[PDB]
Amino acid sequence: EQILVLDPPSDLKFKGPFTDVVTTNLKLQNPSDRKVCFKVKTTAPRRYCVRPNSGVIDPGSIVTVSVMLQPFDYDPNEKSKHKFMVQTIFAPPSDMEAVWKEAKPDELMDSKLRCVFEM
């Protein structure tokens, strides 16, 4: 089960117009007694910038991720199929590459969020 607490927990809302970049915030809170590593993934990688797209959250701490929807011709009639995934693992004791490759699939925790476009 996901250790981090996400606000919003499940739907990311983006408010138009979309002739410019529209940002929504994802709060990642670590309530636990251990450091937690995270990585963000998406079904639509060309459509978004995510900053930070990965990092580590100290026990007790909170990091707010900025999700930047790139400009586009908005069809109020098309509902978004985009999703995000926040993958986490408890932090091991140098390098974050090495961290993700060493991770056992039993260790990995995911949250998924659905994107929602409002006007």
Partner: peptide, 9 residues
């Protein structure tokens, strides 16, 4: 169904 990719920053 959904193929997730690393997000870009």
């Amino acid at each position: 169904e959904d193929e997730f990719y690393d997000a870009l920053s």
